[PDB]
Write a protein that binds this ligand. Structure first.
Ligand SMILES: [Cl-]
Ligand SMILES: [Cl-]
Ligand SMILES: [Mg+2]
Length: 295
């Protein structure tokens, strides 16, 4: 019945100064205050009897205007042994489908569809079919061209995955995007596995269609269920992270679900949001100290 609050800043805008942490912990009459990383993250055990609603509200007031995230959770079982993470705009800085669209001269057209799909204003599968149809005829050569020149890893990603693995967790990159991207990205970052949709080609060029059935919101829920049974755990043993509406199913099922840099409509439906930190925030969410990290 013991709660703990964690405050988290981006290491590139590390504003969680020692005085700010003290003030924050005072704001909740905390038992103590433990630094997971200097100027970046600290744990605050809430007094027994304080509801999770009072803190967070109390802590977001005291921090109002600083780029510092607030999460509250039970301290037991906050370290998870499964990670399931979306790729597009979560572990990479880009939307792979928008990047491919540029090679067809249609970036802005496709990207506006992507934004509504990711906000939940249109269903994923028909949005994906519409966007991929515009890629018809692109040569298979442009995939590596996109990956090598325009895809970048989100800060903190490798360290999150590697540190979780170091501690025995099983880590999976699941994506409504494309296996030709997740395969390379998952290896760059160090995931144990990846699972994504598949572009159809004729042997030289993209047909403009996607292998059916299309993996969407429920396919992420099902992959989390599948991973947990296979490693002999439950989804409660997983932390799930994404930015989009099609991530909310796995975010809501996992024991710890994080909306990471999500738009307000998506972030409204997640119990835990990270708007400032990078992916190391999920390490601090789980109680890790910077000493425990794989550097
Ligand atoms: Cl593919
Ligand atoms: Cl939950
Ligand atoms: Mg995404």
């Amino acid at each position: 019945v013991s709660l703990v609050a964690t405050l988290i800043a981006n290491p590139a805008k590390a504003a969680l100064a020692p005085s700010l942490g003290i003030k924050a912990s005072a704001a909740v009459n905390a038992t103590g205050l433990y630094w997971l990383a200097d100027d970046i993250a600290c744990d605050i055990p809430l007094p027994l009897g304080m509801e999770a609603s009072e803190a967070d509200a109390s802590l977001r007031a005291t921090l109002d205007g600083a780029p510092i995230d607030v999460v509250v959770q039970e301290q037991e079982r906050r370290r998870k042994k499964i990670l399931i993470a979306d790729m597009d705009s979560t572990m990479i800085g880009q939307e792979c489908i928008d990047e491919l669209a540029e090679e067809a001269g249609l970036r802005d057209h496709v990207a506006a569809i992507t934004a509504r799909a990711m906000n939940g204003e249109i269903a994923f599968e028909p949005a994906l079919r519409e966007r991929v149809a515009l890629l018809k005829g692109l040569p298979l050569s442009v995939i590596d061209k996109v990956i090598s020149t325009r895809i970048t890893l989100t800060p903190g990603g490798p360290q999150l995955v590697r540190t979780m693995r170091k501690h025995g967790a099983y880590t999976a990159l699941v994506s409504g995007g494309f296996t030709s991207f997740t395969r390379r990205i998952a290896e760059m970052i160090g995931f144990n596995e990846e699972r994504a949709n598949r572009l159809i080609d004729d042997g030289t060029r993209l047909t403009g269609t996607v292998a059916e059935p299309i993996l969407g919101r429920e396919a992420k829920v099902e992959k989390l269920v599948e991973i947990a049974e296979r490693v002999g755990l439950t989804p409660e043993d997983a932390i799930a992270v994404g930015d989009g509406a099609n991530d909310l199913g796995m975010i809501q099922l996992a024991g710890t679900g994080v909306a990471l840099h999500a738009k307000p409509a998506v972030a409204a439906q997640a119990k835990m949001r990270i708007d400032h930190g990078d992916l190391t925030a999920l390490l601090y969410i789980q109680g890790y100290r910077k000493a425990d990290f794989v550097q």
